[PDB]
Paper text:
Among them, 5-fluorouridine triphosphate (FUTP) is a potent competitive inhibitor of [name] uridylylation in vitro and also behaves as a potent mutagen for picornaviruses including [name]. To gain insight into the role of FUMP-[name] in inhibition of further uridylylation, we co-crystallized 3Dpol in the presence of the modified 15-mer peptides FUMP-[name] and UMP-[name]. Tetragonal crystals of the 3Dpol complexes were obtained in both cases. Analyses of the electron density maps showed that the [name] peptides could not be traced in any of the complexes, most likely due to disorder. However, best-fit structural superpositioning showed that 3Dpol crystallized in the presence of FUMP-[name] exhibited a large conformational change in the β9-α11 loop, located at the N-terminal motif B. On the contrary, the structure of 3Dpol in complex with UMP-[name] was practically identical to that of the apo form. Motif B is formed by a “loop-α-helix” structure located at the base of the template channel and is involved in ribonucleoside triphosphate (rNTP) recognition, template binding and translocation of the nascent dsRNA. In the apo form of 3Dpol, the β9-α11 loop is packed against the fingers domain, forming part of the template channel and participating in template binding. But in the presence of FUMP-[name], loop residues from Ser298 to Thr303 in this motif B appear displaced by 7.8 Å towards the active site, thereby closing the template channel and preventing the correct positioning of the nucleotide template in the active site pocket. Large movements of this loop have been observed ranging from an open conformation, in which the loop is packed against the fingers domain, leaving the active site cavity accessible for template entry, to a closed conformation where the loop is found inside the catalytic pocket, resulting in a conformation that sterically clashes with the template nucleotide. The structural data shown in this work, together with previous evidence of [name] fluorouridylylation, prompt us to speculate that the inhibitory effect of FU on [name] uridylylation might be explained by the stabilization of the β9-α11 loop in the closed conformation, thus preventing the correct positioning of the template nucleotide in the active site cavity of 3Dpol.
Replication of the [name] genome is mediated by a viral RNA-dependent RNA polymerase (RdRp), named 3Dpol through a negative-sense RNA intermediate. RdRp uses [name] as a primer for both minus and plus strand RNA synthesis. The first step of the viral genome replication consists of the successive incorporation of two uridine-monophosphate residues to a highly conserved tyrosine residue (Tyr3) of [name]. This reaction, termed uridylylation, is also catalyzed by 3Dpol using as template a small stem-loop structure (cis-acting replication element (cre) or 3B-uridylylation site (bus)) that is located within the 5′-untranslated region.
Author numbering: 1 to 476
Write the structure that this text describes.
């Protein structure tokens, strides 16, 4: 995005805390090159002269202006992807009821009852529970009033900026590259869910290469589905972006929203409008109010679908800008926000697409970290997606999501205080795919102190999870 105004203000949005993450017993064994992100300017691990306030917003270097020809190409690519999307999903996109918006529907989780409420409710000491009855799926009078302002397209708002208290590579910790989440007002989230919730549910239910989205996938079971699909292609690419979310230009975002969320596809006219409120945003951080043009508000969960849709349109755009006769079936892909796997039987030159992605304000590199850029001949067993590799289990022949051992060492090395037992059982579910020897090694530090699930128990759970009849067949 482009920072068009930075001004000081009364009311500090107090967003410089201490980490709830503490080292575990594993920290001293593994000595990871990771640590909690800096949550304070006075953090002694920060490099000399690094200001948190400056670095967290440094990703906003501009709002790339696309030419008329490029915008008309982008619109064709958006309308072509939308055609595919709404063909698979259908056009049952009537607004969600307030009850359904809060409680969710099949394929869409209920709203979180006690997460951050956003502005100005955070400054008035009003928690989410004060504004919305999540039990009954009803709203208080303030949310009710704000919903009626959005009906009229008169709603205005500020994004509350929170630092992401999490583990980061030590080099990113020192450089002050703390990640941020933009918390929009709870009523804005409610209304967005009203406008596109049915669509969001359908995309979760229909995740797969056909719609180019892994949002709402279960890697445990869906790696088999994904792996057998990409294994069929001569060429597979994993594509790295630099600040994908920030670098979505106003032109791209606006056109995507216009082509994807049309009334003719069953959407309320206001679906396009509430999404378009994401383009030109005001961000509250401490005493600062930063106005940005372009980019998606920072996040993962809340913005996954939009980022995934843009990734799909970007690949069609980039290939059509370089080659003639490119259609959706020229390649296959799956995306989860900025994360992407692309495959084609065609020898697509991804190295030559770099300038074409640059016309969208996006910088692509091979995920590989090759000294050269993109190459042909890569397969599904070479790539990373959701921090997971695709490897066949020798026992069953099924693809399993294998995470890098260094990443599992880092995850096991820190925990929120009092959560260690819960975290071990969760991370065991990830580490089981590393094999029995590495699984044993990763949890050795915790043996005798916590309950570590047997490798055997999680392996048997997994085989049943991915194919029920296969597990049954082994008792022939």
């Amino acid at each position: 995005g482009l920072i068009v105004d930075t001004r000081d203000v009364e009311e500090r949005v107090h967003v410089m805390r201490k980490t709830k993450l503490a080292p575990t017993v594993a920290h001293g064994v593994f000595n990871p090159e990771f640590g909690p992100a800096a949550l304070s300017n006075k953090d002694p691990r920060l490099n000399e002269g690094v200001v948190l306030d400056e670095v967290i917003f440094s990703k906003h270097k501009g709002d790339t202006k696309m030419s008329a020809e490029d915008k008309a190409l982008f619109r064709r690519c958006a309308a072509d992807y939308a055609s595919r999307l709404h063909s698979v999903l259908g056009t049952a996109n009537a607004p969600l009821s307030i009850y359904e918006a809060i409680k969710g529907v099949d394929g869409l989780d209920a709203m979180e009852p006690d997460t951050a409420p956003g502005l100005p409710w955070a400054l008035q000491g009003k928690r989410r529970g004060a504004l919305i009855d999540f039990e009954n799926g009803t709203v208080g009078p303030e949310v009710e009033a704000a919903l009626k302002l959005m009906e009229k397209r008169e709603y205005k708002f500020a994004c509350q900026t929170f630092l992401k208290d999490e583990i980061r590579p030590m080099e990113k910790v020192r450089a002050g590259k703390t990640r941020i989440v933009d918390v929009l007002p709870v009523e804005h989230i409610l209304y967005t869910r009203m406008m596109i919730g049915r669509f969001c549910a359908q995309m979760h239910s229909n995740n797969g290469p056909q719609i180019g989205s892994a949002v709402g996938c279960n890697p445990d079971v869906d790696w088999q589905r994904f792996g057998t699909h990409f294994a069929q292609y001569r060429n597979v690419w994993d594509v790295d972006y630099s600040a994908f979310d920030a670098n979505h230009c106003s032109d791209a975002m606006n056109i995507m929203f216009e082509e994807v969320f049309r009334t003719e596809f069953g959407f309320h006219p206001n679906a396009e409008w509430i999404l378009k409120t994401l383009v030109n945003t005001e961000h509250a951080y401490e005493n600062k109010r930063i106005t940005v043009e372009g980019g998606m508000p920072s996040g993962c969960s809340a913005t996954s679908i939009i980022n995934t849709i843009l990734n799909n349109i970007y690949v069609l755009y980039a290939l059509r800008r370089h080659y003639e006769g490119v259609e959706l079936d020229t390649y296959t892909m799956i995306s989860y926000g900025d994360d992407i796997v692309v495959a084609s039987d065609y020898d697509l030159d991804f190295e030559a697409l770099k300038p074409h992605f640059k016309s969208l304000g996006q910088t692509i590199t091979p995920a590989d970290k090759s000294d050269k850029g993109f190459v042909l001949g890569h397969s599904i067993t070479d790539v990373t997606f959701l921090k997971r590799h695709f490897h066949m289990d020798y026992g069953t022949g099924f693809y399993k999501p294998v995470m890098a051992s260094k990443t599992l060492e880092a995850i096991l090395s820190f925990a929120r205080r009092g959560t260690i037992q819960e975290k071990l059982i969760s991370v065991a579910g990830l580490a089981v795919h590393s094999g029995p020897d590495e699984y044993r090694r990763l949890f050795e530090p915790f043996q005798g102190l916590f309950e570590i699930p047997s490798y055997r128990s999680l392996y048997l759970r997994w085989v049943n999870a991915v194919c029920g009849d296969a597990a049954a067949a082994l008792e022939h």
